[PDB]
């Protein structure tokens, strides 16, 4: 296959292109666009993203205005998620007044191109294969699941309790771990940078429905 030279202006072209990548390994795809494949993503957390973006044309930049977020999902040998999925940085400061409706999380997850990719540690990066892509939007239930988790997490941040957030917070979405934040007393604190992540139950559910369409 050949990478798109200009950003796609229709979801049809974006999806068709994504589909051309299925079956190929990351090494094969990286080589086809003159890119070297790192030994692991420890150094470049967003390497796979840079690569898929090149392929998907990411002439019509913001003009294309597709509003589609690309998200790769490392999966096991059975197509199941291996880890939580990073959504976006969690704002520890500012952004006061934000609500679920006006949140960057809801905005980022409005339209997503999910690309499953093998991710089991035993498989060298260059040998991991790309699976079948998904073009998704949360249904009413998924949006509710995210809203409730988002509201609980953000309220803690706004109340200066970011350091109190743990894996116990959030049924489908969590905030995972120096940057400035709001302290429990309103004092300014320095803490680990945080981010919003989708849990494996949420991403597994949407990946599963992809094989049950009728």
């Amino acid at each position: 296959p050949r990478p798109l030279l200009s950003p796609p202006e229709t979801e049809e072209q974006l999806l068709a292109q994504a589909q051309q990548l299925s079956g190929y390994t990351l090494g094969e795809l990286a080589a086809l666009v003159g890119l070297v494949t790192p030994e692991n993503l420890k150094r470049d957390k967003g390497w796979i993203g840079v690569l898929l973006e090149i392929w998907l044309g990411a002439p019509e930049q913001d003009f294309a205005a597709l509003g589609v977020e690309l998200k790769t999902i490392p999966v096991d040998s059975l197509g199941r998620p291996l880890e939580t999925t990073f959504v976006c940085v969690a704002p520890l400061t500012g952004n006061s007044g934000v609500t679920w409706e006006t949140s960057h999380v809801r905005h980022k997850l409005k339209r997503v191109l999910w690309i499953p990719v093998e991710g089991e540690a035993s498989i060298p990066l260059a040998q991991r294969r790309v699976g079948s892509p998904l073009l998704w939007s949360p249904n009413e239930e998924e949006d509710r699941q995210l809203r409730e988790d988002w509201e609980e997490l953000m309220d803690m941040i706004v109340l200066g309790q970011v350091e109190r957030i743990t894996a116990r917070h959030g049924e489908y979405l969590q905030i995972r771990p120096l940057t400035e934040a709001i302290g429990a007393r309103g004092e300014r604190i320095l803490t680990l940078p945080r981010g919003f992540y989708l849990k494996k139950n949420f991403t597994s559910a949407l990946l599963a429905r992809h094989f049950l369409i009728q």
Side-chain angles (χ1 to χ4, degrees):
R2 166 168 193 184
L4 298 176
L5 264 226
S6 42
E9 300 182 23
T10 69
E11 281 188 350
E12 277 100 339
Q13 177 170 63
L14 172 69
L15 182 62
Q17 178 72 353
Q19 289 175 336
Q20 309 298 292
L21 316 181
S22 312
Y24 282 91
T25 62
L26 299 179
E28 277 155 10
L29 291 175
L32 278 175
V33 295
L35 265 206
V36 185
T37 305
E39 280 315 296
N40 42 72
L41 300 186
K42 297 171 196 169
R43 328 182 150 185
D44 306 86
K45 283 136 208 223
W47 176 83
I48 298 194
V50 173
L51 169 76
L52 285 196
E53 255 165 23
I54 292 168
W55 272 97
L56 307 167
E60 41 223 272
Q61 63 260 274
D62 287 77
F63 174 77
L66 233 37
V68 175
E69 262 285 288
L70 189 237
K71 299 224 149 291
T72 42
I73 296 179
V75 296
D76 60 20
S77 77
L78 288 174
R80 307 177 301 201
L82 286 160
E83 55 187 20
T84 63
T85 302
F86 170 72
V87 181
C88 59
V89 164
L92 299 198
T93 61
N95 188 42
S96 55
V98 71
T99 59
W100 170 239
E101 290 90 352
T102 65
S103 72
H104 198 217
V105 163
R106 195 195 210 197
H107 183 261
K108 277 243 174 190
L109 297 177
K110 185 94 261 169
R111 195 66 165 168
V112 183
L113 175 70
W114 297 113
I115 296 204
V117 184
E118 292 186 306
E120 276 181 22
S122 90
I123 310 175
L125 195 55
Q127 294 177 210
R128 287 157 192 208
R129 305 206 169 274
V130 176
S132 170
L134 283 77
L135 196 44
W136 167 106
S137 280
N139 56 36
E140 276 264 47
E141 181 206 298
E142 287 170 307
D143 193 85
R144 276 169 207 181
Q145 293 170 346
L146 298 181
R147 168 197 293 272
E148 299 200 352
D149 284 344
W150 185 90
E151 297 186 329
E152 158 172 346
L153 293 160
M154 277 311 295
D155 279 352
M156 293 175 65
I157 292 305
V158 183
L159 310 182
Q161 293 187 141
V162 57
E163 301 276 40
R164 287 198 39 259
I165 299 169
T166 66
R168 319 255 240 193
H169 306 278
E171 179 87 326
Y172 307 90
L173 172 81
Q174 0 168 266
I175 282 185
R176 292 199 160 241
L178 281 218
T179 78
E180 211 228 323
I182 298 158
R185 260 138 326 248
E187 85 271 40
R188 294 177 190 205
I189 73 189
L190 292 171
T191 185
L192 290 29
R194 304 292 209 285
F196 276 101
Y197 293 80
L198 289 171
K199 296 183 65 175
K200 293 187 269 165
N201 58 338
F202 189 89
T203 55
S204 183
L206 67 89
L207 291 174
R209 283 182 301 248
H210 184 244
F211 302 112
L212 301 162
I213 300 154
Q214 266 188 15

